[PDB]
Design a protein around this nucleic acid. Structure first.
Ligand SMILES: [Mg+2]
Length: 267
RNA sequence: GAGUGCGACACCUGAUUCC
DNA sequence: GGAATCAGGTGTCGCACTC
């Protein structure tokens, strides 16, 4: 389920009441629950909005209208995966959302990839990339390790990667807003001068933004796909996160380390 | 030692909808 | 009994940064 902002929750509630919806007793941690005919809408205090009952089409459209009314388009959301994992690639993804893309993300109930299973992520990423334009920078470990040699700091590397993608996408698409996770204290500073006239937002919990969340899903799916390829390529079994790393280091032939791991890590 | 942000991974428990 | 959605919480492992 997607996450509504504070203003959207309030505007959605008013809108649904204004066309007759009946308030019902909300479940634990929910803000409100409305019935419209036989369709149920539940909005959690977190902002997550959940459809229930039957004939959910009218509810879905009303939510879409609400989110569309206060979301400036076109916009870009930016996110990375594989940053803190010793094994496998670093992936930076940016998604450009126009109206058709935004409506799609809403329909899909898109949210932060951290809250999604692997199968859900792969499924959603293909739905996303079928509708939205975007750009992905993939750094498999062999490439990552070379890039890291020049930067000697992951934030500096991330800055360079984001700066290039965002600059190119802004020149091409000229969005009204650019939103990105605060991945370093210097990220705003680096991105400020490549976004042209767009409003730039660098902030924590950036995945509350639909386009940022869509980007987290794409970046994560690219990582998962690459992890599988690395496994078949080097005939090795790999953990998606940081588990069993000391043993994995010993098990893995030394000449494959630069091809599988982020060597600068101390694990 | 304690935090913040980013990246995760692995679990527990409760609620809701539909069949 | 099955599919799914949400929420509150626990632990572990990394890079960067602050006190
Ligand atoms: Mg991410």
């Amino acid at each position: 389920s997607m996450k509504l902002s504070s203003s959207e929750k309030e505007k959605l509630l008013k809108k649904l009441k204004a066309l007759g919806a009946k308030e019902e007793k909300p479940p634990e941690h929910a803000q409100y629950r409305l019935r419209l005919n036989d369709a149920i809408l539940t909005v959690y205090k977190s902002g997550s909005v959940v459809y229930g009952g039957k004939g959910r089409e009218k509810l879905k459209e009303l939510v879409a209208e609400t989110v569309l009314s206060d979301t400036e388009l076109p916009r870009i959301g930016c996110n990375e995966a594989g940053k803190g994992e010793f094994v496998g690639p670093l992936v930076v993804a940016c998604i450009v959302a126009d109206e058709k893309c935004l409506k799609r993300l809403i329909e899909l109930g898109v949210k932060d990839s951290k809250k999604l299973s692997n199968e859900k992520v792969e499924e959603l990423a293909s739905e996303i990339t079928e509708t939205c334009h975007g750009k992905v920078k993939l750094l498999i470990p062999e490439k990552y390790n070379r890039a890291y040699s020049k930067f000697k700091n992951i934030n500096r590397l991330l800055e360079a990667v984001y700066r290039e993608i965002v600059s190119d996408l802004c020149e091409k698409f000229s969005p009204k807003v650019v939103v990105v996770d605060k991945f370093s204290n210097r990220a705003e500073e680096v991105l400020k001068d490549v976004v042209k006239g767009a409003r730039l937002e660098v902030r924590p919990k950036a995945e509350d933004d639909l386009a940022v969340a869509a980007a987290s899903i794409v970046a994560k799916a690219v990582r998962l796909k690459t992890m599988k390829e690395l496994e078949k390529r080097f005939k090795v079994k790999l953990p998606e996160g940081n588990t069993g790393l000391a043993e994995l280091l010993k098990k893995t032939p030394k000449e494959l380390h630069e091809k599988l791991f982020k060597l600068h890590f101390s694990v």
